[PDB]
């Protein structure tokens, strides 16, 4: 993927995270678990709803379109009507299949970027209070209980509150 996260340095997805597209797995002394990041999931849902609805809006509505009849001395006109019908059909088939191919490629890159942005957001909160151990995981240099975990998940992690304990463990 273009942004290196999905099927990249985060090798796989989580069947255990059932309630959003992107999120967190935590492990501390109180235990372990999955939580979806509600905000990044919802932003992506807003974007893709709008993308689907754009395709819908741009196609509009096909009004009544029926065959036409020509007598035996109207062959040229018959063939011209058929050339018109076939021509338009070629073009709309082409536009439809291509629009979907190209938008599918962009939709997957979009998710890849969202996951990457989420990772960088956490990394930026934690600074040197945690170690990047790859596969998208951080190893805290301090005890991070459920309340601390939640503060990471919702963007209020208190870096100075734990810097000293972290510096010592990082030695």
């Amino acid at each position: 993927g273009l942004f290196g996260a999905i099927a990249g340095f985060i090798e796989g997805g989580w069947t255990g995270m059932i309630d959003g597209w992107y999120g967190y797995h935590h492990q501390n002394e109180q235990g372990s678990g999955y939580a979806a990041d509600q905000k990044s999931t919802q932003n992506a849902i807003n974007g893709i709803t709008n993308k689907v609805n754009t395709v819908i809006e741009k196609m509009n509505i096909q009004f009544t379109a029926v065959g036409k009849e020509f007598n035996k001395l109207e062959k040229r006109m018959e063939n011209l009507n058929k050339k018109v019908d076939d021509g338009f059909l070629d073009i709309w088939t082409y536009n439809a299949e291509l629009l979907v191919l190209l938008e599918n490629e962009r939709t997957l890159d979009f998710h890849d970027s969202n996951v990457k942005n989420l990772y960088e957001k956490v990394k930026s909160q934690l600074k040197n209070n945690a170690k990047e151990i790859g596969n998208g995981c951080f190893e805290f240099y301090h005890k991070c209980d459920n309340e601390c975990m939640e503060s990471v998940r919702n963007g209020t992690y208190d870096y100075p509150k734990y810097s000293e304990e972290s510096k010592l463990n990082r030695e």
Partner: protein, 324 residues
């Protein structure tokens, strides 16, 4: 030996696949089908109005009143017109129907009409016989004729020059049809019309045509060496149509006061009428869909998805599905 938080993404058991430019058949967690391929296999009303089923008849037979089409006489309004592969009863006395395809095109925007007696049988032709029939237009085994036309023949050995007119006070367009008989030999000509050099003239304010019989012995068709050509014209509100003949005129008896509509048309269909209502009718069935595309049929009545040749149009909404 340390607490961890990891960033990750959703996986599930979806087997949905989509195509992309760089890669085909990517399995994704969620997706949405954009291509409608489902129809109810029936003919339906459009906005509560039933279509006009010609059945074994075609437009020609319907509007001339081919006796096989008698069940269509009372029908006055429709949402669309359905011909079938067996729509074979048209002209029953052989001949040419002039500008027939134009006439069908005109009926495609008609949504209802009024069948009315433009030239009543018992009072328009006091000096002519209004009784000609033919075995080519049999009904129930007896020779008969179109329910909307009238064969005028000699009465007591003379075919006096006739001149009748009608004035369109219907306040709508009036479709008028008539016919021109061409006997196969001079004997039949004189026997039916008593004037071997006959002619017919039809004139409105914007229509002007004159007809001359062409008498010759032609290959028999429905057991007739004679011919009958059929003609029509639209009479504008307030305009006057005038017929004038000393022979060979197949006169109008019934005509149609038309009312125009939008989104009608003629289709050919195998399918059976049903007690259903639809916004979108194809010849194969009715579509009930919000999807933007369909590969069901290029011919559509109503408000339909766009026809495409595609077998598959699936848009990914979720992610690459990578269950671990």
């Amino acid at each position: 030996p340390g607490d961890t938080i990891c960033i990750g993404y959703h996986a599930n058991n979806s087997t949905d696949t989509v195509d992309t430019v760089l890669e085909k058949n990517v399995t994704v967690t969620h997706s949405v089908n954009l291509l409608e391929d489902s129809h109810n296999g029936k003919l339906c009303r459009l906005k509560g109005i039933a279509p006009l089923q010609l059945g074994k008849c075609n437009i020609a037979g319907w509007l001339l009143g081919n006796p096989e089409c008698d069940p269509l006489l009372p029908v006055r309004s429709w949402s669309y017109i359905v011909e079938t592969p067996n729509s074979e009863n048209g002209i029953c006395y052989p001949g040419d129907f002039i500008d027939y395809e134009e006439l069908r095109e005109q009926l495609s925007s008609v949504s209802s009409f009024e069948r009315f007696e433009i030239f009543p049988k018992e009072s328009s032709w006091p000096n002519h016989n209004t009784n000609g029939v033919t075995a080519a237009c049999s009904h129930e085994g007896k020779s008969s004729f179109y329910r909307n036309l009238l064969w005028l023949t000699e009465k007591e050995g003379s075919y006096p020059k006739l001149k009748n007119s009608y004035v369109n006070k219907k306040g709508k367009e009036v479709l008028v049809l008539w016919g021109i008989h061409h006997p196969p030999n001079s004997k039949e000509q004189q026997n039916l019309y008593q004037n071997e050099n006959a002619y017919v003239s039809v004139v409105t304010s914007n229509y002007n045509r004159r007809f001359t019989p062409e008498i010759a012995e032609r290959p028999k068709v429905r057991d007739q060496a004679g011919r009958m050509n059929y003609y029509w014209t639209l009479l504008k509100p307030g305009d006057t149509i005038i017929f004038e003949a000393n022979g060979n005129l197949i006169a109008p008896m019934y005509a149609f006061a038309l009312s125009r509509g939008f989104g009608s048309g003629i289709i050919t269909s195998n399918a059976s009428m049903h007690e259903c209502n639809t916004k979108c009718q194809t010849p194969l069935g009715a579509i009930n869909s919000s999807l933007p595309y369909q590969n069901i049929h290029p011919v559509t009545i109503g408000e339909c998805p766009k026809y495409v040749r595609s077998a598959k149009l699936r848009m990914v909404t979720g992610l690459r599905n990578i269950p671990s």
